[PDB]
Amino acid sequence: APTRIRDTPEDIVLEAPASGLAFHPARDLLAAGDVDGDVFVFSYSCQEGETKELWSSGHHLKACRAVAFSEDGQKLITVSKDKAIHVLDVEQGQLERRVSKAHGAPINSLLLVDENVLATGDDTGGIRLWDQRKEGPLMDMRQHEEYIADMALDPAKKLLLTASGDGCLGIFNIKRRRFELLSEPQSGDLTSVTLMKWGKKVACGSSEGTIYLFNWNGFGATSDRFALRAESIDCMVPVTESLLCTGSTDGVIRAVNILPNRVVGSVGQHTGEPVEELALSHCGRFLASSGHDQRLKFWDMAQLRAVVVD
Numbered sequence: 283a284p285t286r287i288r289d290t291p292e293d294i295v296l297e298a299p300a301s302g303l304a305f306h307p308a309r310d311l312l313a314a315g316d317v318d319g320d321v322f323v324f325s326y327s328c329q330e331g332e333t334k335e336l337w338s339s340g341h342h343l344k345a346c347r348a349v350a351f352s353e354d355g356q357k358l359i360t361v362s363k364d365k366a367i368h369v370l371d372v373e374q375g376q377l378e379r380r381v382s383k384a385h386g387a388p389i390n391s392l393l394l395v396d397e398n399v400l401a402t403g404d405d406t407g408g409i410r411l412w413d414q415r416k417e418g419p420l421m422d423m424r425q426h427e428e429y430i431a432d433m434a435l436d437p438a439k440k441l442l443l444t445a446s447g448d449g450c451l452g453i454f455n456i457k458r459r460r461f462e463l464l465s466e467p468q469s470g471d472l473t474s475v476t477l478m479k480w481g482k483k484v485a486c487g488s489s490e491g492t493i494y495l496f497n498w499n500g501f502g503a504t505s506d507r508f509a510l511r512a513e514s515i516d517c518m519v520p521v522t523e524s525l526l527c528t529g530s531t532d533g534v535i536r537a538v539n540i541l542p543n544r545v546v547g548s549v550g551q552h553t554g555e556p557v558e559e560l561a562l563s564h565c566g567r568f569l570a571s572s573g574h575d576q577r578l579k580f581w582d583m584a585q586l587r588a589v590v591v592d
């Protein structure tokens with residue numbers, strides 16, 4: 283009394299723009315990592331006043347480019363232009379493990395594979411796989427020629443898929459610690475990669491505003507492409523097996539259906555400011571976006587998930 287409720291959590295206003303963004307797998311927590319290296323965990327709620335910073339930490343002294351929560355919800359893993367990988371505890375953001383010198387170049391991309399294994403990708407295209415129980419990387423692959431923009435995981439956890447600024451989709455066999463192939467290079471930098479259609483399609487967003495599709499186990503060349511009415515796609519996240527959201531340098535977040543390929547419409551925008559990253563809540567209800575306006579914004583996915591069909 284008074285309880286003031288909205289349809290989404292309030293915007294989170296940051297002091298520096300954030301490339302790192304992830305939702306907790308079981309709790310109403312959102313993590314961000316910013317261009318100064320700072321990392322934050324926020325509680326979020328549709329009740330006004332109840333979206334609050336729970337902790338911040340300043341262990342990285344250069345840009346924190348990606349963050350991810352462990353599957354058990356206990357740890358937050360962060361990577362940085364300082365070339366380090368850190369393991370933090372979710373409760374307080376205390377540093378529990380520091381893996382410095384993890385790459386020879388700034389780390390841009392992070393993907394957790396299982397409770398002991400993760401992959402990192404750097405600004406020169408280097409890909410490494412790590413088991414926390416073994417010293418040194420399991421794999422060191424430099425077939426890519428430009429930065430690793432994004433990575434995705436085979437549901438069977440066999441293949442790691444990579445999107446690179448060299449215009450290629452990369453395929454690595456995690457189980458065999460080996461390179462399989464690079465796709466034919468595309469005209470746009472591949473900024474984003476996600477699995478769609480129950481793992482049967484690979485969707486990659488490009489710096490020219492195209493989405494490329496590849497068939498599963500046909501990674502060598504695209505099976506389809508279509509363009510948005512946008513100059514770029516810089517980040518994507520799947521909402522359903524057919525629907526994903528994109529963020530672009532024009533600041534607009536777009537809902538896009540795959541096969542049939544259609545722009546459903548605009549979810550929202552960071553007016554006139556590039557969208558840097560997206561994430562989806564564990565419950566599926568909220569999309570979060572991080573923009574160059576230094577805001578984390580929440581969007582209700584219910585209207586979409588209703589309208590949406592196989």
Ligand SMILES: C[C@H]1Cc2cc(-c3ccnc4ncnn34)ccc2O1
Pocket residue numbers: 352353357359367369379381384394395396397398399400412413414415
């Ligand atoms: C870079 C070093 C440090 C580190 C940490 C982890 C970790 C810890 C906790 N939960 C997790 N879930 C997924 N990976 N993972 C895994 C590998 C690894 O190699």
